[PDB]
Amino acid sequence: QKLIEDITKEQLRTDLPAFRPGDTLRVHVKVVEGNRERIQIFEGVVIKRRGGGISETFTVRKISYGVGVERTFPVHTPKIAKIEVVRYGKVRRAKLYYLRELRGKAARIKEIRR
Amino acid sequence: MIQQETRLKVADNSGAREVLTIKVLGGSGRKTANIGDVIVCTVKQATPGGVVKKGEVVKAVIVRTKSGARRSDGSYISFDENACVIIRDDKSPRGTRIFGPVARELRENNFMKIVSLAPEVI
Amino acid sequence: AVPFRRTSKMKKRLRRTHFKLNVPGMTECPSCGEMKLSHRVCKACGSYNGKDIN
Amino acid sequence: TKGILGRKIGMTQVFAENGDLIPVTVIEAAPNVVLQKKTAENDGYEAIQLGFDDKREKLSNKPEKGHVAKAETAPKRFVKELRGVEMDAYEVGQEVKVEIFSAGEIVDVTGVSKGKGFQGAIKRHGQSRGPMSHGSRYHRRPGSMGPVDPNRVFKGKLLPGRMGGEQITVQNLEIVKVDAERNLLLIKGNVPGAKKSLITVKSAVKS
Amino acid sequence: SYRKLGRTSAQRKAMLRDLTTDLIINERIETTETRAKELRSVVEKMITLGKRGDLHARRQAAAYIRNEVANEENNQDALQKLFSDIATRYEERQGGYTRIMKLGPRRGDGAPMAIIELV
RNA sequence: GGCACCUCGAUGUCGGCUCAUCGCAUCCUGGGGCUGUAGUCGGUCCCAAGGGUUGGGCUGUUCGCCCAUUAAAGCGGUACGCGAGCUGGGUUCAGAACGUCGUGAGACAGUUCGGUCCCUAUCCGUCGCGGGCGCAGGAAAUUUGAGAGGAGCUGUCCUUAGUACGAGAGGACCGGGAUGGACGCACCGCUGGUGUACCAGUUGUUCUGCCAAGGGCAUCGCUGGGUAGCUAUGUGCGGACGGGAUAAGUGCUGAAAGCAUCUAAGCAUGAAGCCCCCCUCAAGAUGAGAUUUCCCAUUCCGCAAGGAAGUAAGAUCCCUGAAAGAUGAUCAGGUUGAUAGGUCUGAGGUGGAAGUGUGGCGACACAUGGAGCUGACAGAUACUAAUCGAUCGAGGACUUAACCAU
Ligand SMILES: [Mg+2]
Ligand SMILES: [Mg+2]
Ligand SMILES: [Mg+2]
Ligand SMILES: [Mg+2]
Ligand SMILES: [Mg+2]
Ligand SMILES: [Mg+2]
Ligand SMILES: [Mg+2]
Ligand SMILES: [Mg+2]
Ligand SMILES: [Mg+2]
Ligand SMILES: [Mg+2]
Ligand SMILES: [Mg+2]
Ligand SMILES: [Mg+2]
Ligand SMILES: [Mg+2]
Ligand SMILES: [Mg+2]
Ligand SMILES: [Mg+2]
Ligand SMILES: [Mg+2]
Ligand SMILES: [Mg+2]
Ligand SMILES: [Mg+2]
Ligand SMILES: [Mg+2]
Ligand SMILES: [Mg+2]
Ligand SMILES: [Mg+2]
Ligand SMILES: [Mg+2]
Ligand SMILES: [Mg+2]
Ligand SMILES: [Zn+2]
């Protein structure tokens, strides 16, 4: 738990801000097609932040053209150029799984600023 | 995990609204078919117009699934609905448009004509 | 199932070569002299490891 | 060929330079020590002995003490034998450090599987069940024993019993990174055995 | 992990909550072997709660200690005795407040017996 | 179908399920000869049994038809394999109705609705796990391998090349490279599952004298998450490259028979078959092997063989446990010591404790404060328990032989 810890500490990224589940943010992903380096912006609510160490991940959910697209990343990958933070939400959870349903039904369910 | 007897919804203006799965194309097993596979399928529900009738055996490809799809660097993508496009037994679609997001494991196959008709690709 | 044939004496007492007891692990309690069993309090003297247990 | 002996410590991850995730198994080591040579004029083959992970002098008996005191070292806990190798770059007392595997190589990993206990058939041999409804009284039982005509059971049936604990060899793995300082070996994939166990990392036989 | 001791998830908690206050009021009891090996890790945690002296610690321990009378004449209680006495006594000890001594077997069912006592 | 030799002091019959194994008169994959084979596809015959050989609709169904795939959807034996392994839809008990026959009771190789499936494994057999003695002194480890088992499958695409072939249409063998299906092995870092002594919210009612704060029961009361272990649907790997003899075929020289001829002398080549290469078990392989290291100058009886007693190396009893486990067994330890527990310090999980204060009429909100709580994860620290002790365990039989010296 220590010997592994250091050899993985060698590759930790140490420039991204902190954030909890339930706050909008913007990820700049360095998607590649083979000859150019585009950058796609994918913003949404952080449904989940899981794991610890170099194996730490997190999930972002948005609603694009009706249907909702979830998308998870390893926090320390180099295919992410930066991470903005749009706003902060007030939630009582650590894993927001009730949002996967409160999308339609002619009622908008969003969080509150804190 | 699309398998026999699944009911998918059609993601373009061909004339079908839902479709049922009759067979996964592949080897002699092939219980399951994830994003970017071709399926034999029968039209259950249809619109009054359209070029596709009710009760027809058509080819189809798969664009969205609830089951995710793992990528190279260990990143995942998921949706909340299964969706399909009706192939003409040639990789061209049998419609004109596409409705919604389309996955990215398509372009790595010969399905350029479909990813070129989508609003956006995630 | 039901026994096809009865069992002789020879087999009946070959089977019982492993059905017996074992002498326990006994030692001398060096406070009184009677035999206790190892790692346990001496129920005859009431002591263990020198000190006592009223 | 070449090979060493180490201890499994547990799995982890590393990013390559492409920026892609790779499962990785860590294996620590130490300087092994050649304790004996088996030449063809004394035995029927060619083989050296390797030692590993010395143990304190109270846990060693006099035979082992005398055996390991001819290379002038300390009583080793794991003793094995690497057979197929050139036997002129090895002397008794000399060491075999972890620095013999470059990055991107291809190795094999031999280790003892971890025990599962007394398991049935559905789990040991990967069989199928009967139904769980429709009036049945059959599920999780090993099936028919065979035909009536032999009047006996054929040698080779598959029944419950003790599972795991055997010796297994995985082939065509690959070294990721070799930390020469801390005596570490990052191998891609997973390897058999419970944590804190002996693992033999030889070179590739297929080629 | 831990032992199940033949009982159920609630009968087990009831038994342990009984034996804890028994050992507290008595300073030594006697029971079977395994049932006394599973108790010297539930008693020492409550002694560690008692060595804190806070109010949060008192309310955490009250949700585990039943209500018997320790000292009948002073109208004391298991909780107050725990805190005051067994915080004054084991003040410079770091772990290991108990000890187990083995008697022989029982007579009725040949089970092994033992003694447990606060050091 | 024929016979009636066995079974009437009792063997119960068809389909389906679980598990299979064998034969070749070969469905596929491999190698060839002829062709009314230009190429791509075919036909028929020869060698070949290593592996593979599907999901549904209708019918109790075997059978059978149809849908969609597939490299292919083989034919048969094993009491038409397997009911002290399953089922009971169909076969022939007692109830009832329809058709026909009978004057009637009733009958149907006619139809339809309903209808009890018993058994604690003695012996052989199969799968695992231990005690005993043997292996010419007593122990500890590393091994060789007579022999045994496992695996054995295939698709698409790009190139060679729109070249050979062909009016055109159409379109290759041989050889290279990627990437899949089904199957097997291992593992938990990722994605998920479970997690009944983990964290939080909440309903009813009883208890801690009361308020606050909590406990008991109601399926773990219910609801949302979830550590370690165990897991697949998740991840990694595998069936590679070859060698030696062959089958059918193709042969080179060469006579019997002045020529011809694959053969009688002689010399080759030639397959997913066979023996090795790959993986596992293996000296009870009574033919009981090999290598390296420890212990040995005792004491009594016995003319002698031998017997007995204390021991040496080593082992066990007993205790603390788990990377082990039905129980033995195995593995890590037993005070010059981190084996377990406790305590500290962390990782991860939950998610902002009690008290107090401020705001509000009140339900409540904010601050102190990533707070408090924490089972099975990691590291330090002898605080508690692994006390004292006992039992077992050698003294190495003969007979020949070869080389050296007298
Ligand atoms: Mg099945
Ligand atoms: Mg026989
Ligand atoms: Mg007769
Ligand atoms: Mg007659
Ligand atoms: Mg007869
Ligand atoms: Mg009879
Ligand atoms: Mg044949
Ligand atoms: Mg239907
Ligand atoms: Mg039959
Ligand atoms: Mg027959
Ligand atoms: Mg039978
Ligand atoms: Mg009747
Ligand atoms: Mg009538
Ligand atoms: Mg009439
Ligand atoms: Mg019926
Ligand atoms: Mg039975
Ligand atoms: Mg984990
Ligand atoms: Mg009241
Ligand atoms: Mg109240
Ligand atoms: Mg009550
Ligand atoms: Mg309850
Ligand atoms: Mg729950
Ligand atoms: Mg542990
Ligand atoms: Zn005594």
Residue D180, token pair as written in the block: 């020469």
What does R_g of chain A's alpha carbons equal in angstroms? Answer: 16
> Percent helix, strand, coil in chain B (nearest 5)?
5, 35, 60
Give the pairing of strands B7-10 and B83-87.
parallel
- Looking at the structure of chain C, the number of domains it has is 1
Token pair of D183 as six digits = 């005596």
Query: CA of E24, closest CA in chain C: separation in Å?
Result: 19
- What is the token pair recorded at B95? 């419609």
Residues of chain E contacting C48 with CB distance shorter than 8 Å: 101
Residues 109-148/D with CB < 7 A to strand F: 110, 113-118, 123, 125-131, 134-138, 141-148
Chain E residues whose C-beta sits inside 8 Å of any chain C C-beta: 101-104, 115
Q: Which two tokens stand for residue A20?
A: 């909890």
Contact by Cβ (8 Å): D107, D175: yes
Q: Which nucleotide is at minimal CA–C1' distance from A70?
A: F191
Backbone angles phi, psi at D81, to 5 degrees: -155, 120
- Residues of A at the D interface (Cβ-Cβ below 8 Å)? 3-4, 7-8, 11, 54-55, 74, 76-79
The string of DSSP codes covering D115-159 is P-EEE-HHHHT------SSTT----SS------STTSSPPTT---
Which residues neighbour D88 within 8 Å (Cβ) at sequence distance 6 or greater?
none
Note the CA–C1' distance, D74 to F138, in angstroms: 27
Task: Please report, as a single letter, which amino acid is at residue B32.
Answer: T
Angle value at C-alpha D113, between D112 and D116, nearest 5 degrees: 140
Tokens of C23: 């002498």
How far is the CA of D18 from the CAs of A11, A77, D15, D37, in angstroms?
Answer: 14, 10, 8, 45
Q: How far is CA D38 from the centre of its chain?
A: 23
Q: Judge contact between B63 and A67, C-beta under 8 A.
A: no
User: Residue B91's closest CA among B57, B117, B114?
Assistant: B114
Q: Which of A101, A77, A79, A99 shows the shortest CA–CA distance to A89? A: A99
Q: In sequence order, what DSSP letters do the residues of D76-100 get, joined into one string? A: EEEEEEE-SS-SSS--TT-EE-GGG
The residues of E between 14 and 73 with beta carbon within 7 Å of nucleic strand F are 14, 16, 37-38, 40-42, 44-45, 48, 55-56, 59-60, 62-63, 67
Q: What is the dihedral of CA D130, D135, D137, D143, to 10 degrees?
A: -30
Q: What are the Cα distances from residue A105, in Å, to A64, A101, B1, C46, D120?
A: 17, 9, 27, 79, 50
| Alpha helices by DSSP H, C5-54 | 9-14
Residues near E118 by Cβ (< 8 Å), separated by ≥ 6?
E23, E27, E28, E43, E86, E90, E97, E98
Name, in order, each residue with C-beta under 8 angstroms of A114's C-beta and a sequence gap of 6 or more.
A88, A89, A90
| Cross-chain residue pair A74–B73, CB shorter than 8 Å | yes
The CA distance from A64 to the nearest CA of chain D, in Å, is 27
Task: State the structure-solving technique.
Answer: cryo-EM
Strand, coil or helix: what is A93?
A: coil
- Residue E12 in 3-state DSSP? helix
Q: Identify the domain containing residue E93 by its residue range.
A: 1-119
Cα dihedral: D104, D109, D114, D118 (round 10)? 130
**Could you tell me the distance in Å between the CA of residue A66 and the C1' of nucleotide F96?**
63
Resolution (A): 3.1
CA A51 to C1' F348, in angstroms, rounded, equals 8
For the purposes of burial, counting CB atoms within 10 Å of the CB of B89, is it exposed (0-12), middle (13-18) or buried (19 or more)? exposed
Boundaries of domain holding C14: 2-54
Nearest to B79 among A42, A69, A73 (CB): A69
User: Which chain B residues have a beta carbon less than 8 Å from that of A76?
Assistant: none
Structural domain count of chain E: 1
Q: Which residues of E touch C34 (CB under 8 A)?
A: none
- Beta bridge partners of residue D49, listed in sequence order: D81
> Dihedral angle at the C-alpha atoms of E61, E62, E66, E69, nearest 10 degrees?
100
DSSP H helices, chain C, are: 9-14
Query: For residues B84 and B9, is the Cβ–Cβ distance under 8 A?
Result: yes
Tokens 């909008």 belong to A24
Task: Concatenate the DSSP letters of all residues of B29-74 into one string.
Answer: ----B-SS-EEEEEEEEE-SSSSS-SS-EEEEEEEE-SS-EE-TTS
Q: Are B18 and B9 in contact (CB under 8 A)?
A: yes
Tokens of E116: 């447990």
Q: State whether A7 and D9 contact (CB < 8 Å).
A: no
Cross-strand bridge partners of residue B121: B102
D105 CB neighbour count, 10 Å cutoff: 15
Task: Say how many Å lie between the CA of residue D150 and the centre of ligand 9.
Answer: 16
Chain D residues with at least one Cβ partner in B under 8 Å:
13, 15, 19-21
Q: Do chains D and B touch (3 or more CB pairs under 8 A)?
A: yes
- CB atoms closer than 10 angstroms to residue B8: 23
Which residues of chain B does A79 touch, with a Cβ-Cβ cutoff of 8 Å?
Answer: 73, 75
Q: How far is the CA of D195 from the centre of ligand 23 (A)?
A: 11
Residue-range domain boundaries for chain A: 1-114
CA angle D146, D148, D154 (to 5 degrees): 45
- The packing angle between helices E11-26 and E78-88, to 10°, is 60
D94 close to D117: Cβ distance less than 8 angstroms: no
Selected residue of A28, A70, A76, A80 to mutate for chain B interface (largest B Cβ count, 10 A): A70
Strand partners, A14: none
Q: Give residues after which chain A gaps, C-N over 2.5 angstroms.
A: none
Q: Between A67, A72, A77, which is nearest B79 by CB?
A: A67
Flag if A54 and D13 touch (Cβ within 8 Å): yes
- Cα E63 from Cα E43, distance rounded (Å): 14
Strand order in D21-28's β-sheet?
Answer: D167-170, D107-112, D198-203, D3-15, D21-28, D184-188, D175-177
| Distant-in-sequence, close-in-space partners of C37: CB < 8 Å, separation ≥ 6 | C24, C25, C26, C27, E104
Tokens of E46: 């409550």
